[PDB]
Amino acid sequence: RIRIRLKAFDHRLIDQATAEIVETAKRTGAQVRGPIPLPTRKERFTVLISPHVNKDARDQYEIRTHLRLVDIVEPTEKTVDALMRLDLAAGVDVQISL
Amino acid sequence: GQKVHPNGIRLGIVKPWNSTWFANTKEFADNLDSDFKVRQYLTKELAKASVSRIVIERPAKSIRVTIHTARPGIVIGKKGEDVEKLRKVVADIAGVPAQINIAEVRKPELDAKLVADSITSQLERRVMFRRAMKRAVQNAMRLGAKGIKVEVSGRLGGAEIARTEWYREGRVPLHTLRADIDYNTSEAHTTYGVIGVKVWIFKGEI
Amino acid sequence: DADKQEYTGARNARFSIFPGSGLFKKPPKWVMVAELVETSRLWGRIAARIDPEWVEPVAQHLIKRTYSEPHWERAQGAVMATEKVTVYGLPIVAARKVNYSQIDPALCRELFIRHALVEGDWQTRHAFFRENLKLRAEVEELEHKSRRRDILVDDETLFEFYDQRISHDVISARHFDSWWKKVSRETPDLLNFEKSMLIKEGAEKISKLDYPNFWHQGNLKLRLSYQFEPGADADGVTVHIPLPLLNQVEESGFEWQIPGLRRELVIALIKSLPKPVRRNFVPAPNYAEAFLGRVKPLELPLLDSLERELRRMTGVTVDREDWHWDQVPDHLKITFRVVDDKNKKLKEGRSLQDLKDALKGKVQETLSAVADDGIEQSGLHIWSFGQLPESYEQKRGNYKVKAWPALVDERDSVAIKLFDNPLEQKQAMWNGLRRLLLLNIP
RNA sequence: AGAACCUUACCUGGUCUUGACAUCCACGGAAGUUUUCAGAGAUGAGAAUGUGCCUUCGGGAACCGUGAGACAGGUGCUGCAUGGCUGUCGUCAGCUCGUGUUGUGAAAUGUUGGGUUAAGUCCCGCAACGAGCGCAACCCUUAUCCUUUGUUGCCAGCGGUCCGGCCGGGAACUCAAAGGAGACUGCCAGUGAUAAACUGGAGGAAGGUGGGGAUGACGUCAAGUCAUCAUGGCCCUUACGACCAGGGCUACACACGUGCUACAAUGGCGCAUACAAAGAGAAGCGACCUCGCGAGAGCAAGCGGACCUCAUAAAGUGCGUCGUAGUCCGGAUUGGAGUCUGCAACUCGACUCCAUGAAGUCGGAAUCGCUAGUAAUCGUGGAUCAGAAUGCCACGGUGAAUACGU
């Protein structure tokens, strides 16, 4: 019913961020689906290192978007007032779809 | 030049990111440009404040900037006056309301970037580079570093031909990723050209 | 200006004290001048010190009042703010804590009604206030029992209960007490809450038998307390045990819970089984209803009850190590607490062994406090105690309290001390009797 | 990591001089919107309306316009003045220091010697004793299992089937991403200085740095970059600075480098049909339906995306034909008709259709890559990108030969 989509660049950052949401939601209304691991979009990037020549040597960096899903299936609108007071860390995106 | 940047390779292991925020491809670029556009002003205006490291967070249309300095009484100033003067100007640059947290840097000669900026000064103050690198290397050993390697290059003391010099004491396991290496660069603009500075400082194995 | 001999006058204009003045050497913090003159710089000729308190009451038409930090305070029951006053922009008072609610009546009426009445965080002798806190308290225990937060209606409906029945005169806490004095002569019961806190949910069918307030164990009776806050240190059905009654408490049959969590318990127990074992009982809640449809509490222990009936329905045996209790949520684990006569908590935990392993000294001192007779002696050589008590039983108010006295060897003589479990009584009887014998033997 | 203009630094021509881009001062108007004439282009001229802020009644903020001087500007020179970064020997296994000893000394010893290893890797000996930069490990991915959770992901056991996981449902499984376990010569036998270690075996998904990657020491080449940036010195400052239009970077008696496509029957063409992984998408991906032979066009869902879209994988298999004919091989070149992007497709795009069918029949001296999921071959996606790849980067499918040996 209520879908919380959580996206971040770090897996060590998003686990407590999805733990804070799923514990506070289960504390005051319960019945939350498990925090879903979802496939990571990996943006792998090819950059030339030298200013002028030698194409054959390059660097390899990547962006790992760690994405998680948390689902609430039942009406539990006592939580929806205090759930806005969580003010989580800056590295995690949250999107709500009803 | 074939050595890799030690701070870049150590990003996922032991060295934290210099900025942690999320953005999609729409606002990723303007996040970066505004992340730059805050950064020269803090280094230029607080050049006398001995700033070491600047971290940016973007928590949901706000900005948190963490300034690491060894002399917090200069940036804060007399009777708590200049941080609020620094408060609106970054918001003027970024366009969002922001809050700046001052992080004190105790143990100052154990930070590479402040070591790099302090070793920058005396070269354009025209004292000898041999005594300068010597002074910056024993105090880290005296106050308990576990390894330090510094480097200078390019027209030393008026030499017509560029020479590179490096002093190393202790242990610098640059090939060990789990070892904690502190490394950053600085430049000194003398009358003869550009003095380059590279300094690596090692403290712990994990 | 601070540590600077220029003087920030009215507006952004700056001047100074004239060098011919008597007080030119000591410029005060607040100085006023008679004539302003333009020269090489600006100056003031006739200068004199004033107190900054004097200017404000004479400049009522000139003060620009400013209010910042609007925060509500419990200490006065109203909104507080720091005020700032300016004449042509001059900070007469840099900061002053002022009552923001007394200044404007509009926004603080909604603030005061929500805080001091709906939340009810007041310290007052009002008759409606004592009953309304109880009325909100008698539905929260229902939600602490039913474990669903849908029964209680929102606080905005409680906010509209106060606001639509209060007069418009009340904008603060001080206006309310004046209002409550007139109004309560007519309708004390108007502000008291009705019983419309439950409407439709279907979870309002909370049965007192499936959520009892007391637990029975032999001749004992254990008080039950309820809380619904998962992940907490003290969540779950909590038992309140008297400290002198502890020696009559036994752990068998304690894990059956109340019937309100029995369906949910055995699901987690089947979930605690490993995946090859778990696949046999598919699905786990369906097997629970057939299990609960045939068993009754205390006929078998909890571990044995599940093993026999699952083999009854399926035919594959389950060992005692296939059930994992760490994977069971801690709210299903009964919180164990020991009480005094005033319900002061001394130790708490989630098993009876979390109590008895630390309370043995204080249980002994509980026994000795009641035992005001000379049964316990020291320095004894020959049996002079008559018919020694096999078990020492006392009474403390409603409940009995049991013990077991025994002898104690002291390497010079025999003593007598109390013990709280028959086995070490026999051990202390054995060492005491043998030592008493060889002293009695010449 | 992508030249029609732009990019663009080049050329011709038309233009500007505190300037296209900054800061300071003084003055006027808020800004801005719309219209017409001339010019290839930057000017000149109107009409509408500006005018929100801040009460200390004033001014200030944003912006535009004008003038002056301090000043800006340069893809101008010097990579042999430099920083930063890069290639290289070379992932080669080597490179040094403190103290001590020897030698007047430059220097040596450590680092050599016996084995051993991918390795100054390790054991023993040893006037060396230790240490540091390197090796390895710690990092990422892949090869197996277990714990958690289960959407949009899965369908084993159930039921209804609209035969479609479609639905109710079930969490088993695949998988997803977090946590762990595992591989360490750990065990056994032989050899070996009672050592390091080597050889074979058990067990195991994997056995001897398991496979791949990232990681590159002291330094060499006065190596490459002043044109990414920063930068010392010199040079122009009414021009080596600046704006615009058009052309040029795409020319062509030639030669070289690297690729793509073929010379064919293990093949070509047509029909039918099966099996992937990985990635991208909001000034975007763009379903379905309709129109056209087709490039595409109209219409217009869903999708910030395990859902929707790009998006039918192809070599493969089964049928029919071709039959060694410069051919039903090969597609160059050329003419006509079109589609899309974009102010604009002449120079100077890409694609479609029709017409054409050059050379080429396996290539001289010589020369290159590859030690296994590799070579070879068949396709797919992505960065740049309005439009543009046979190049680059990445992903899968089929899938070898050979290593006697120095």
XYZ file of C-alpha atoms (C1' of nucleotides) in Angstrom, chain D residues 182-322:
141
model
C 34.896 -21.769 2.621
C 41.076 -22.770 0.085
C 45.011 -21.680 4.545
C 50.448 -27.003 1.864
C 45.075 -27.522 6.101
C 45.905 -33.557 6.089
C 48.543 -38.042 4.363
C 52.914 -40.666 1.613
C 57.859 -40.009 -0.513
C 62.276 -36.806 -1.281
C 65.074 -33.151 1.231
C 70.349 -30.073 5.941
C 65.800 -33.343 11.680
C 65.092 -26.900 7.145
C 62.933 -24.051 3.467
C 60.589 -26.591 -0.019
C 59.248 -30.034 -3.916
C 56.307 -34.408 -6.143
C 51.697 -37.408 -5.841
C 47.120 -38.658 -3.300
C 42.664 -38.109 -0.110
C 38.671 -34.692 0.761
C 36.306 -30.632 -1.711
C 32.747 -26.243 -6.137
C 37.670 -24.602 -6.434
C 44.967 -27.073 -4.476
C 49.236 -25.229 -4.547
C 50.321 -16.150 -6.275
C 42.243 -21.180 -7.982
C 40.941 -17.423 -12.617
C 40.675 -12.042 -14.035
C 41.392 -6.939 -12.386
C 43.129 -2.735 -9.497
C 47.943 -2.007 -7.240
C 54.178 -0.384 -10.203
C 59.932 0.799 -5.961
C 64.804 3.757 -6.612
C 65.126 5.951 -11.098
C 66.118 6.322 -17.161
C 64.706 8.799 -21.685
C 66.594 17.412 -20.390
C 60.458 11.515 -23.436
C 55.062 14.145 -23.987
C 51.773 18.137 -22.532
C 52.914 26.273 -21.653
C 46.777 23.738 -26.283
C 43.129 21.118 -19.909
C 44.698 24.011 -15.812
C 48.239 26.649 -12.750
C 52.730 28.903 -13.675
C 58.407 32.217 -13.923
C 60.441 35.212 -17.818
C 59.780 37.542 -22.677
C 56.384 39.453 -26.382
C 51.158 42.595 -28.778
C 48.151 46.096 -25.913
C 44.375 51.042 -31.845
C 46.000 44.085 -31.571
C 49.441 38.096 -31.829
C 43.160 41.297 -28.171
C 37.455 41.176 -29.703
C 32.495 40.319 -32.851
C 30.178 38.337 -37.342
C 29.416 36.049 -42.617
C 31.534 32.504 -45.832
C 35.231 28.940 -46.756
C 39.220 25.400 -44.542
C 40.479 21.486 -40.674
C 36.938 16.631 -45.228
C 41.973 18.893 -50.975
C 45.152 14.512 -53.979
C 50.421 12.490 -59.329
C 51.465 9.582 -54.308
C 53.630 6.382 -49.777
C 52.968 4.381 -44.889
C 50.078 2.903 -40.267
C 45.507 0.542 -38.071
C 40.979 -1.533 -39.105
C 36.469 -2.934 -41.737
C 34.249 -6.089 -46.361
C 35.253 -10.058 -49.572
C 37.602 -13.518 -52.944
C 32.797 -18.435 -51.407
C 29.569 -24.629 -51.039
C 32.141 -25.400 -43.496
C 28.895 -20.861 -48.596
C 24.993 -17.459 -50.617
C 19.434 -16.654 -50.913
C 14.344 -17.555 -49.190
C 10.963 -19.883 -45.553
C 10.169 -21.857 -40.513
C 12.163 -22.133 -35.551
C 15.279 -22.435 -30.460
C 19.021 -20.498 -26.733
C 21.714 -14.975 -23.887
C 24.243 -11.525 -20.800
C 25.147 -6.453 -19.984
C 23.716 -1.337 -20.338
C 20.791 3.339 -21.191
C 16.171 6.482 -20.811
C 12.725 12.834 -18.699
C 14.664 19.262 -23.614
C 14.495 11.311 -22.739
C 13.232 5.814 -23.639
C 9.531 5.672 -26.411
C 4.537 0.240 -26.357
C 0.173 -0.641 -29.260
C -2.758 0.890 -33.699
C -2.873 3.088 -38.623
C -0.158 4.729 -43.545
C 3.980 3.557 -46.943
C 8.030 -1.581 -50.403
C 11.142 1.131 -46.999
C 13.879 4.739 -44.545
C 10.183 6.760 -41.486
C 5.167 9.568 -40.633
C 0.709 10.291 -37.790
C -1.629 8.920 -33.322
C -0.276 8.410 -28.380
C 0.097 4.220 -23.425
C 3.500 3.151 -19.749
C 8.050 4.519 -17.849
C 13.173 8.663 -13.330
C 12.113 2.664 -14.681
C 14.069 -5.879 -11.679
C 7.253 -3.471 -13.875
C 7.585 0.424 -19.194
C 10.839 1.175 -23.655
C 15.214 0.622 -26.564
C 14.598 -4.924 -27.997
C 12.950 -9.865 -33.151
C 19.826 -11.555 -30.825
C 22.865 -13.851 -34.603
C 25.929 -17.499 -35.874
C 22.792 -22.508 -34.573
C 18.721 -26.330 -36.640
C 15.121 -28.208 -40.401
C 13.420 -27.522 -45.532
C 13.935 -25.813 -51.154
C 17.478 -23.796 -54.652
C 22.235 -22.447 -56.512
